[PDB]
Curated annotation (Swiss-Prot), chains A, B, C, D, E, F:
UniProt keyword annotation of RNA-binding present: yes
One example of a Gene Ontology biological process annotation: transcytosis
Protein name as catalogued: Advanced glycosylation end product-specific receptor
The encoding gene: Ager
GO (cellular component) term, any one: nucleus
Residues of the full protein shown: 23 to 228 of 402
Predominant location category: membrane
Ranges where the Ig-like C2-type domain occurs: 96-189
Amino acid sequence: MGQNITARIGEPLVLSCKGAPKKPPQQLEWKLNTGRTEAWKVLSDSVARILPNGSLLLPATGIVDEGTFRCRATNRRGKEVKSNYRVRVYQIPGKPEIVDPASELTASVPNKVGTCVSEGSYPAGTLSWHLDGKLLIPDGKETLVKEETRRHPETGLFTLRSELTVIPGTHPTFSCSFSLGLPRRRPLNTAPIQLRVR
Amino acid sequence: MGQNITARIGEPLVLSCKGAPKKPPQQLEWKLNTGRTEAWKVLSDSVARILPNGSLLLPATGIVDEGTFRCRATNRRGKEVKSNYRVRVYQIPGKPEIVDPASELTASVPNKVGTCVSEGSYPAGTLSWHLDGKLLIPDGKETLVKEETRRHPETGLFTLRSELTVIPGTHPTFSCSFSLGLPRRRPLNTAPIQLRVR
Amino acid sequence: MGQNITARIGEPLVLSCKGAPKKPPQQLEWKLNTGRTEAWKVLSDSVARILPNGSLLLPATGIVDEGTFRCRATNRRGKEVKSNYRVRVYQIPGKPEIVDPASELTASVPNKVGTCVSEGSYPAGTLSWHLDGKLLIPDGKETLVKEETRRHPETGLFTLRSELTVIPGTHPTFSCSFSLGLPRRRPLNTAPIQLRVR
Amino acid sequence: MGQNITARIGEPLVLSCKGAPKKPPQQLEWKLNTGRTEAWKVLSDSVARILPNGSLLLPATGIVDEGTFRCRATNRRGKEVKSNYRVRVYQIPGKPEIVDPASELTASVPNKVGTCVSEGSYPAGTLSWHLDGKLLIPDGKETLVKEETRRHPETGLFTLRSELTVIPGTHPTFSCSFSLGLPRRRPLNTAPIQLRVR
Amino acid sequence: MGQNITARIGEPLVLSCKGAPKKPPQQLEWKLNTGRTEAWKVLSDSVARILPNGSLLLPATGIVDEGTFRCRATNRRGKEVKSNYRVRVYQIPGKPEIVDPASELTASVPNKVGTCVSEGSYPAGTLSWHLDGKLLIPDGKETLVKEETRRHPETGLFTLRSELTVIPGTHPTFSCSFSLGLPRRRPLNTAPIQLRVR
Amino acid sequence: MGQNITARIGEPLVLSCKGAPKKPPQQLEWKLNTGRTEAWKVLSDSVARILPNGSLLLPATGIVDEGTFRCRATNRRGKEVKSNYRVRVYQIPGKPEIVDPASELTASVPNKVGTCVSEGSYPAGTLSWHLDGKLLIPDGKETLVKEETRRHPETGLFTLRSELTVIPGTHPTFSCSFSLGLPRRRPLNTAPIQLRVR
């Protein structure tokens, strides 16, 4: 059950090879499929390095380290041991913040309440508003929300924004929460396609 | 409860610092007390190295890596976070073996049965014999055992030997087991003394 | 006039020391004040490294490399030569984009036209709109604009947003331009203060 | 006569290439056959490294460094120079020790005198006892000796043990000596075979 | 016009690749033709190293770094960008010196005036004498000069010597100047031939 | 007798420390006085590096590596062992060559015979001529020789030149030999002085 790894971006990861001798000499090779990999990388540093015990070391994991990590090693008994890991990664964004807040609302007409912003998450996750602590669902009348998620190409992290409009009453309290989109375990994805736009 | 670490010799260990920023710049220093340390080592490679996230990395742990690992880091909020680990280590020896076995015993007199040998353990652990599966206790008459533990100065690992003599009967079966001396958690030791022999 | 350097983030920079011998041995030391520096760094790698000719090398410049770079070297004639550089840095953001555009406007009432977004600049620079190619100034009636600049703490880069509202007519064309805030040369800044908020 | 090298384990070895230019550029390649080598290693670090003068450097020699070291280099005159070394290695064990000694012997019956132990030799070498300084040969009656040599798989070094039994007299003195098995020069060995045990 | 580089020996050189992404991952390879290269070197350290932005770094340029530097990179838009540099190098020699000077000349006969020496130039450049500040041309009678240029095989640098003989008058002043042979731009050379001397 | 080392420039040198343990941990420090050293260097790479056995490694020795190499080490028995080496260095120059030779001599007047040149020696050594194999001494009449030794500041190596003039006879043969100035062992030198020239 432990061939799937979830790892926070920035932090080291060690992947063991089982069957590698505790110390050199060792017959082993690692082959990787990542965001960095064209097809497959192969070795026997600060990118990826092999420890004395044959384990694989990534000094600080990033989105580009997601994918398949495989080892093949000739074991001390002379035959081959296989290792197969799937690495997924995540980032927790900063505290969410409410920008452009209204100080006063006028009952019976629509008002821009504010925008909730989360900066720097992976994967995107979602934002939602509460009013006096209950989840608000958008309707077409008394409420509507425009949300934008935009990804930073220089880091791969996401920014969410959620802008609330309401048509009201007396004295309500509001707040926003960010729920990361991570599930329990392993979602399954097709290989990607890339059509051209004419 | 996790400031104590037990680690198998040969294998990498990562110790986190809590409070270090996820990435550089960081104000932090590690200070170590080990078998290598005279008093205290200090840094901010293949001996000991600091990862991008500020964590401490030992590429392959050995007996000489036992001791105290401390971090002090100036946290992102501006004040100081402390880390304190105690590292202990172990090695599993090879399969035990019986050497110099007797093919035949003569009832009513003492016979050298054989020596059970374990090679390459840390800490020493112990050897014990079974006869038809039950633990044998030594007595002064029908049985006696001479045992020797000797440590390799070039590796720190131990060799145990246990030589059985018996005074017997019909048709008994014998075998030896090695029980490592590791307990659950944390034994407590005085600082050592070193008197001179006149 | 060349003691000030402007350098694009990501790219290498070489700073010469004048007076250093063309090759070793050399008596010289570099001392740095940067975003990384607490007070002053000192040396005689991928952070900062000294080349064979005594020059200073930064392998990929970033915002954290802004500041003062000083060399002191004992010259071939036996006396001392001083070097003093001031490094400033920049990033060009991605192409600006218009998000949430309106397809139709109604004359005589205010309409949300769209938001112009620039992602990933340093320093921030500014956004401005044109209508049929002329600069629009905001007024209080026929036009107003809300703009937000937000900085990414994990990279130091900025995101600008500019949201246009208009009160109109027949058939206008719109577009937005991003003007980086860099000037010709050397603006001068006070040392910073950091009061506490009660 | 100097193409054979004998080297103590732990210590550096430099092997020259003759014909390599005193400095770069150089056309040369080293190919090795060792305990580490599957077939042949090839290069033009702390495992094996090439010095500026083209010589081969092993930072600390071990049993695994035994074998064939070959260089081929394109010489300054344009044609090829060949180098061929055979490396053999050794370790001196610790002082021998006598364990389990008897304080008293009874004349006319056999007595276990003691075990002489040597720890940490390569190659094994041998142990022998003296009584009042003369070599003892084993017989079947007045003396017999059981000896064991056991090799440490984690280091390749050997432990010898020699257990003396005697059938005596008045007042003899005993002592043991360790004679390393190294000869003058170059013993010759067949390539090994490895049959299977059914 | 900037695909030709002239660089002083000893000093670093950075060659950019255009089209390489500002940061990793990048698909690119450098191939070099130099004095070090047999045919072509290829990579994706202190010899030649690739910076984070994909640029090529030579830590201290020498005569052996003259030649062709090519990059091929898969650009961020997915297709290929080519780079092509031609590197030439130079060294300024030391101050010229006059050796073996005559204190007195006798009119009407030839006298050895002195030798002007320049040490350590690349390319060779030339020496010439002035008498009361005017260029002297050699004739067959009143003047003649023997000059020697000799190159140091261990460095590639040149030594020039120029020995003046004159047939004189009253009170002339003499001095020598060294004019480096560098031109403006790019001389063009055939590929070399190497006939054998019988 | 082996605390003095003579080493050819360009080639590696290993200096042992005696008393250092065969392997880490070790308490030792090296302190050096060389052409590179201002006063004394201290350590516990390609400049100078310490091997696993505690020995000192210079990867390619040069004139700048001449001087005093000292080790101090805390030995396995707990007390201190001292090491003290004196390193001297040399270079063999290229084959000597005769330049500017005369094809014909006229008896009864002086003739410039030729210059013998040696390039690239350390220490300087000397040049001498033979005529039909016998050493020529200079006189004031039938022979005289002007010799020049000039040192390359960029390498420290020497160039010798020896220019022969003779006043002759029938059919003599000439040749020149270079005799390096190295003696057997250890010349002794005062510490240097450096007066100023007014």
